Amino acid sequence: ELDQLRQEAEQLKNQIRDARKACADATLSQITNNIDPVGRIQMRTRRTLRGHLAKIYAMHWGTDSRLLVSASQDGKLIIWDSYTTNKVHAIPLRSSWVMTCAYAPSGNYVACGGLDNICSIYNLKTREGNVRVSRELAGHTGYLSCCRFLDDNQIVTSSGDTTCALWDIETGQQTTTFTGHTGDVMSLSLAPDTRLFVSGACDASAKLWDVREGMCRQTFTGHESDINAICFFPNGNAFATGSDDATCRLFDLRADQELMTYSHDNIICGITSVSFSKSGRLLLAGYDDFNCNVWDALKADRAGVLAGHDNRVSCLGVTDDGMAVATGSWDSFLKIWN
Amino acid sequence: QVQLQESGGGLVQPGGSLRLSCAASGFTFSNYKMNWVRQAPGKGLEWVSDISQSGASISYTGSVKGRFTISRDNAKNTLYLQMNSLKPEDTAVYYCARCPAPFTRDCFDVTSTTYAYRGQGTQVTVSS
Amino acid sequence: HPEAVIVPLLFALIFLVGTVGNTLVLAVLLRGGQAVSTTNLFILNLGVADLCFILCCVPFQATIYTLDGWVFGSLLCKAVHFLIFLTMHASSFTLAAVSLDRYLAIRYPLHSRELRTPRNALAAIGLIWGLSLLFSGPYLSYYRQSQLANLTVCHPAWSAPRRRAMDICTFVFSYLLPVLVLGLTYARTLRYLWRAVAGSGARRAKRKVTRMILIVAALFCLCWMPHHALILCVWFGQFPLTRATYALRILSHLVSYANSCVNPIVYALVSKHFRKGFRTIC
Amino acid sequence: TLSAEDKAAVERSKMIEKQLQKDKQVYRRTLRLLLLGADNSGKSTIVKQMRIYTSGIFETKFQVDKVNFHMFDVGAQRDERRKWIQCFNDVTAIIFVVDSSDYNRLQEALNDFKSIWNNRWLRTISVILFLNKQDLLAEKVLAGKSKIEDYFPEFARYTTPEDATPEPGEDPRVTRAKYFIRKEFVDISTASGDGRHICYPHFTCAVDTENARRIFNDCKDIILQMNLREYNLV
Amino acid sequence: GWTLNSAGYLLGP
Amino acid sequence: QARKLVEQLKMEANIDRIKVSKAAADLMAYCEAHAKEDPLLTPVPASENPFRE
Ligand SMILES: CC(C)CCC[C@@H](C)[C@H]1CC[C@H]2[C@@H]3CC=C4C[C@@H](O)CC[C@]4(C)[C@H]3CC[C@]12C
Ligand SMILES: CC(C)CCC[C@@H](C)[C@H]1CC[C@H]2[C@@H]3CC=C4C[C@@H](O)CC[C@]4(C)[C@H]3CC[C@]12C
């Protein structure tokens, strides 16, 4: 019975490809060719955060655009103050192999996880002033790659078992699951409406899911290698993905087709992180060539190059107000660009 | 999408020869290392041969040395595998696998049970 | 005309070589990243000492052997002459400490991981500088600015027994003890490495390490040997004042400056691992 | 010059820095190893012998000659080491266990070894090879019902090296078999590396304890190699 | 070619 | 089972897609409308920059 299922699936995907191609009347390069370029953009290292013992693997900005969180492979989460360069908090972890971290929008909780298959959530504001483990969500069979907060009692996690999950922090039980991927989910990205989220797997594919339904809303393909990081557009109708083929791909949610591509002959290294600015004109991407590149989202041109790291760039983040950009590499150092 | 279509299988007599063809689509064939893997009925996945991007540094497993030969044509993006002096223990499903990362010399998880960058495989039966 | 216009040429050549070597070493040690390390601090102290020794000994002695009089002030006759011996003693003690640290790191690769700290390296560097200052102290009054045959000179205007005793003391403390320490340490290290107790790569690495150790040992043993030999010949022999003696003195000064000129070469830019620092400074 | 909150935050940051400096002394004195190996290799026996001194990763801490070694072993991972293998790029050594008694997996083990030796992020990590289950291989090759040349044709042309120094009272056939199995991994390893890392093959039988010493010595040599790169001696 | 500035510097007064 | 896969394909085939030029124009308008309050594309003076020296 599989013989007819295969041909049915292939004719369905051919029909989908034809319906997607029928809507492609003009490329984005043909629409924004008359737009003046952004010129040359140069940024300098404003501050350098040191203190980590092992390589830095994760980093996320808060809602106040002042505090920052970083995760090191020695089993340490460090919350820094970006304005005063002082260390606000230091939390030791149970497992040293942490691969992701998250900061709650209210600033009360901090989530982390990794090769221990357990998502540890710590509380920052305690009655005694000391940071303690608030909860340990277990149940996954693979390593955790990314986690993001929806609210004070809901957390979206991505594991290496080709599935994503949404957990209730107040209860501790898995609220819902998202299945369908054929590879390890590598990154997550929440929409501004906190109702849709994209997740890319190690199969050159990504899927947009709805939080309130738990079913696959949309699927996107086009890459040639595994996708490592995905970032949503500020408007909520587009998203950029980066893979190991040294090429970024910006898709839109309404047209369901590859909209923009970013590549160069002198770039043959993998991509580790992607992020947008407030306006959405600049796209920052960290590569394995020890440097980061800021491309023009509307013209696919190299607008700027940020160098200064001695090892592979691991994480890159942009503040909510777009004032500074945090970069973290395997050199155990954090850099602030502006 | 990464598509790898295999063809050239079927049922043949022992001591014959076959020519398996692997057609790639959706990526630059001249930049990824290719390999041919084998899965026996009732057994696990067993790697057979592999070839790099340019066409050199070809390698085979100890059980197929001298009998199988793999080559690649980048002009048409095709992977050919000539199989001479077939034995009755070679009846199995052949898969055309691709290297996960380009411009590399190491390809991990090419023999995984649920690897994504592989085709459906072709059946090769060796009997009367 | 030989020995007339080639002496300042060779002086300028060795000065430029030493300066560019010291600068290329210090640029990689200070800039690039990860500058805090026991070995890195030792190599940095050695390079700084050699650079200061060159800058304080090559131009002044070149002007002395080129011009017929001292064209500097009264404070430039007693200060830089002290800096010279200070830097040479600092470099000798730094090489001794480097050899001792190599022995500690090779004999006990694991049991010496708690004693090899940047704090201990800074303490050893401070002790080296203090000992060098204590040994170079008398060089403030050793050389004095005087007058000879209607020309202002800067000469060691001390008594003969006191000058001889000071020369013997500085020869014992700056040449004998460091050479003995380096010899014993390298002998023990090479006996431990070639012990009876696979692959050709390990044998090639051992041969390269042995060759480097023998080269640096012979260099340190032969760079300062002719200077002290000439000093002892002056203080105990005839030492006639002829052209051959002047040529021998010039050659001794050249081979003594060659020590500080080639120390950054065989210590820092001899391995392919260090030169990779050129990929981060550009 | 500053408010009370500013100096309080400065004092808190200084205390956090002192705590980090105190933890660094304990962190830098522990050697971390990564244990790798497929099924039917004997990793459980090795870890249960070394412990005499849904979890994701199993951690085993043991002290040898006042030196602390923490070995991390893979747990509930779904046999996909393409992504999470990069997190172990700063380990001291990778102890790879290979079952030399099962021929049908030996070549597969090769496919697991070479990819690790040619990994882009594992070029500066040493690999200690443990060929486990030597008695099973010995009895199999003495039984005479399993021919190695059926899977490796070059074994038909392989001979015992002249510098062979086996244990007194050992069969020459089992010695030649063990040496061929070791030479396979040696040729796979020496194909690249450029002297950045060396492979240390060892013959273990999962019933001996001195292996726990061997690794130690090997680790020492690894540190020695690091020293050879610090003083620019090689 | 010894000079009064070199011989005097080397041998003293 | 391929039944779930073909069901997902049939469900994703019926999506109200629009023309790519309209989405491109909308994204261009969104990018050009918020260009004034972007501290990364339009640098602000150091008097109002919290990350100054
Ligand atoms: C200026 C004059 C006095 C320098 C004389 C050189 C002497 C002090 C140095 C040069 C090479 C050295 C030798 C090198 C080999 C070692 C082997 C060891 O088992 C005993 C000491 C011994 C034998 C050293 C003794 C001292 C030594 C002979
Ligand atoms: C500064 C110098 C003169 C000190 C001499 C140190 C001696 C003890 C060391 C330095 C180099 C060593 C030699 C290096 C080569 C090996 C080859 C081996 O097949 C036998 C021992 C042998 C021949 C070593 C013998 C001891 C050795 C000679």
DSSP state string for chain D: ---HHHHHHHHHHHHHHHHHHHHHHHHTTEEEEEEEE-TTS-HHHHHHHHTT---SEEEEEEEETTEEEEEEEE-S--S--SSGGGGGTT-SEEEEEEETT-HHHHHHHHHHHHHHHT-SS-TT-EEEEEEE-HHHHHHHHHHTS--GGGT-GGGGG----TT--PPTT--HHHHHHHHHHHHHHHHHHTTS-TTS--EEEEE--SS-STHHHHHHHHHHHHHHHHHHHHTT--
Residue D39: Cβ-neighbour burial (10 angstroms; 0-12, 13-18, 19+): exposed
Rg, C-alpha atoms of chain B: 14
For residue C189, the CA-to-ligand 1 centroid distance in Å is 14
The nearest alpha carbon in chain A to D54 belongs to: A141
Spatial separation of the C-alpha atoms in residues A53 and A75, rounded to whole Å: 10
Please name the amino acid found at residue C196: A
Instruction: Give contacts of A310 with chain C, Cβ < 8 Å.
Output: 32-34, 280
Backbone dihedral region for residue C239 (phi beyond 0: left; psi -120 to 50: alpha; all else: beta): left
Q: Which residues pair with A20 in a beta bridge?
A: none
Residue corresponding to tokens 């390298």: C186
Distance from CA of D188 to the nearest CA of B (A): 12
**Residue C173 DSSP symbol:** I
Measured from the Cβ of residue A92, the count of other Cβ atoms closer than 10 Å reads 12
The residues, any chain, with a CB within 8 Å of residue A259's CB and separated by 6 or more, are A28, A238, A250, A251, A252, F20, F23, F24, F27
Q: Are D35 and D73 within 8 A, CB to CB?
A: yes
The length of chain B is 128
Q: Which residues pair with A56 in a beta bridge?
A: A72
DSSP helix/strand/coil, A266? coil
Most distant CA pair in chain F, distance: 63
How large is the angle between the packed helices C118-136 and C80-107, nearest 10 degrees?
Answer: 140
For residue C192, the CA-to-ligand 2 centroid distance in Å is 10
DSSP helix/strand/coil, B22? strand
Please name the amino acid found at residue A53: L
Task: Kindly state the tokens that stand for D23.
Answer: 């933890």
DSSP β-ladder status, B10-12 and B122-126: parallel
Q: Are A56 and A71 within 8 A, CB to CB?
A: yes
Task: Kindly state the tokens that stand for C24.
Answer: 């290329």
Q: Which residues pair with A187 in a beta bridge?
A: A200
Q: What Cα–Cα distance (Å) separates residue A16 from each residue in A9, A85, A216, A253?
A: 10, 52, 16, 15
* Main-chain phi, psi angles of C125, to 5 degrees: -65, -40
Nearest to C273 among D67, D224, D229 (CB): D229
Residue A323: Cβ-neighbour burial (10 angstroms; 0-12, 13-18, 19+): buried
Distance from CA of F24 to the nearest CA of A (A): 6
Q: What Cα–Cα distance (Å) separates residue C234 from each residue in C173, C177, C241, C254, E7?
A: 19, 22, 11, 19, 12
Residue A23: Cβ-neighbour burial (10 angstroms; 0-12, 13-18, 19+): middle
Spatial separation of the C-alpha atoms in residues B99 and B117, rounded to whole Å: 8
Q: Are A172 and A181 within 8 A, CB to CB?
A: no
The answer to whether the CB of C191 is under 6 A from ligand 2 is yes
Distance from CA of C184 to the nearest CA of D (A): 18
* Main-chain phi, psi angles of C257, to 5 degrees: -70, -30
Nearest to C109 among D28, D224, D233 (CB): D224
**Residue C175 DSSP symbol:** I
Instruction: Give contacts of D228 with chain C, Cβ < 8 Å.
Output: 205, 209
Spatial separation of the C-alpha atoms in residues C98 and C43, rounded to whole Å: 8
The nearest alpha carbon in chain B to D152 belongs to: B62
Measured from the Cβ of residue C164, the count of other Cβ atoms closer than 10 Å reads 15
Domain ranges within chain C, ordered by starting residue: 1-282
Q: Are C247 and C3 within 8 A, CB to CB?
A: yes
Task: Kindly state the tokens that stand for C33.
Answer: 């990243």
Domains and CATH numbers, chain A: 1-337 (2.130.10.10)
Testing the interface with A: which of D15, D19, D54 to mutate, by most A Cβ within 10 A? D54
The residues, any chain, with a CB within 8 Å of residue A224's CB and separated by 6 or more, are A204, A243, A245, A247, B2, B26, B27, B28, B102
Q: Are A255 and F20 within 8 A, CB to CB?
A: yes
The nearest alpha carbon in chain E to C152 belongs to: E5
Helix, strand, coil share (%) of chain C residues, nearest 5: 75, 5, 20
Domain ranges within chain D, ordered by starting residue: 34-42+84-230
Query: How many angstroms from the chain centroid is the CA of residue A148?
Result: 9
**Residue A72 DSSP symbol:** E
> Which residue's CA is minimally distant from atom 10 of ligand 1?
C183
Q: Are A147 and A166 within 8 A, CB to CB?
A: no
Query: How many angstroms from the chain centroid is the CA of residue F32?
Result: 13
Residue E4: Cβ-neighbour burial (10 angstroms; 0-12, 13-18, 19+): middle
The terminus-to-terminus CA distance of chain A in angstroms comes to 60
Q: Do D13 and A87 touch (CB under 8 A)?
A: yes
Taking the Cβ of residue C116 and every Cβ of chain D, the question of whether any pair is shorter than 8 Å is answered with no
The answer to whether the CB of C194 is under 6 A from ligand 2 is yes
Taking the Cβ of residue A40 and every Cβ of chain F, the question of whether any pair is shorter than 8 Å is answered with no
Task: Kindly state the tokens that stand for A247.
Answer: 């090429």
Query: How many angstroms from the chain centroid is the CA of residue C93?
Result: 9
Spatial separation of the C-alpha atoms in residues C136 and C142, rounded to whole Å: 10
Spatial separation of the C-alpha atoms in residues B86 and B126, rounded to whole Å: 7
Spatial separation of the C-alpha atoms in residues C226 and C253, rounded to whole Å: 9
User: Which domain CATH number covers B59?
Assistant: 2.60.40.10
Task: Kindly state the tokens that stand for D130.
Answer: 């443990």
The answer to whether the CB of C195 is under 6 A from ligand 2 is no
Spatial separation of the C-alpha atoms in residues F21 and B7, rounded to whole Å: 40
Residue C112: Cβ-neighbour burial (10 angstroms; 0-12, 13-18, 19+): middle
Rg, C-alpha atoms of chain D: 22
Spatial separation of the C-alpha atoms in residues C148 and C142, rounded to whole Å: 17
Taking the Cβ of residue B103 and every Cβ of chain A, the question of whether any pair is shorter than 8 Å is answered with yes
For residue C190, the CA-to-ligand 1 centroid distance in Å is 14
The answer to whether the CB of C227 is under 6 A from ligand 1 is no
For residue C190, the CA-to-ligand 2 centroid distance in Å is 7
Q: Which residues pair with A133 in a beta bridge?
A: A122
The answer to whether the CB of C187 is under 6 A from ligand 1 is yes
The residues, any chain, with a CB within 8 Å of residue A29's CB and separated by 6 or more, are A260, A299, A300
Query: How many angstroms from the chain centroid is the CA of residue C165?
Result: 22
For residue D222, the CA-to-ligand 2 centroid distance in Å is 24
Task: Kindly state the tokens that stand for B69.
Answer: 């030969």
Q: What Cα–Cα distance (Å) separates residue A273 from each residue in A58, A189, D84, D153?
A: 10, 12, 16, 47
Resolution (in Å) of the shown entry?
Answer: 2.6
Task: Tell me the best of C184, C210, C213, C222 to mutate to test the pocket of ligand 1, counting ligand atoms within 8 Å of each CB and taking the most.
Answer: C184
Q: Are A232 and A219 within 8 A, CB to CB?
A: no
Spatial separation of the C-alpha atoms in residues B114 and B118, rounded to whole Å: 9
- Angle, CA D23 vertex, CA D22 and CA D29 arms, to 5°: 105
Please name the amino acid found at residue A188: L
Closest CA to C4 of C65, C54, C70: C65
Spatial separation of the C-alpha atoms in residues C85 and C175, rounded to whole Å: 12
DSSP helix/strand/coil, A295? strand
Q: Are D218 and D128 within 8 A, CB to CB?
A: yes
CATH topology of domain D34-42+84-230: Rossmann fold (3.40.50)
Lateral strand order in the sheet of B10-12? B10-12, B122-126, B92-98, B34-39, B45-51, B59-60
> Which residue's CA is minimally distant from atom 11 of ligand 1?
C183
The nearest alpha carbon in chain A to C276 belongs to: A310
Q: What Cα–Cα distance (Å) separates residue D22 from each residue in C112, C119, D25?
A: 19, 14, 6
- Angle, CA B42 vertex, CA B38 and CA B46 arms, to 5°: 25
F and E touching (3 or more beta-carbon pairs closer than 8 Å): no
Spatial separation of the C-alpha atoms in residues A45 and C224, rounded to whole Å: 48
Structural domain count of chain B? 1
Q: Are A280 and A239 within 8 A, CB to CB?
A: no
Q: Are D227 and C105 within 8 A, CB to CB?
A: yes
The answer to whether the CB of C183 is under 6 A from ligand 1 is yes
E-strand stretches of B8-110: 10-12, 17-25, 34-39, 45-51, 59-60, 68-73, 78-84, 92-98
Closest CA to C268 of C221, C225, C202, C216: C216
Distance from CA of C246 to the nearest CA of E (A): 7
Measured from the Cβ of residue A307, the count of other Cβ atoms closer than 10 Å reads 10
Spatial separation of the C-alpha atoms in residues C218 and C212, rounded to whole Å: 10
Q: Do C68 and E4 touch (CB under 8 A)?
A: yes
Instruction: Give contacts of A184 with chain D, Cβ < 8 Å.
Output: 80, 83
The terminus-to-terminus CA distance of chain F in angstroms comes to 61
Backbone dihedral region for residue D133 (phi beyond 0: left; psi -120 to 50: alpha; all else: beta): left
DSSP letter string, A145-187: EEEEEEETTEEEEEESSS-EEEEETTT-SEEEEE---SS---E
Q: What Cα–Cα distance (Å) separates residue F29 from each residue in A25, A294, B39, C121, F25?
A: 19, 20, 54, 61, 6
Structural domain boundaries, residue B110 = 3-126
Task: Kindly state the tokens that stand for A189.
Answer: 């990205």
Spatial separation of the C-alpha atoms in residues A58 and A148, rounded to whole Å: 12
**Residue C193 DSSP symbol:** H
Nearest to A244 among B101, B114, B120 (CB): B101
Task: Kindly state the tokens that stand for C158.
Answer: 């001390």
For residue C191, the CA-to-ligand 2 centroid distance in Å is 7
Taking the Cβ of residue D13 and every Cβ of chain A, the question of whether any pair is shorter than 8 Å is answered with yes
Measured from the Cβ of residue A338, the count of other Cβ atoms closer than 10 Å reads 20
Which method was it determined by? cryo-EM
Nearest to A31 among F17, F24, F51 (CB): F24
Nearest to A97 among D54, D76, D87 (CB): D87
HSE of D157, CA atoms in CB hemisphere, 13 A: 2
Residue C163: Cβ-neighbour burial (10 angstroms; 0-12, 13-18, 19+): middle
Residue corresponding to tokens 């000058």: C163
Backbone dihedral region for residue C121 (phi beyond 0: left; psi -120 to 50: alpha; all else: beta): alpha
Spatial separation of the C-alpha atoms in residues D173 and D157, rounded to whole Å: 14
Q: Do E6 and C163 touch (CB under 8 A)?
A: no
Q: What Cα–Cα distance (Å) separates residue A109 from each residue in A64, A194, D202?
A: 14, 18, 49
DSSP helix/strand/coil, A261? strand
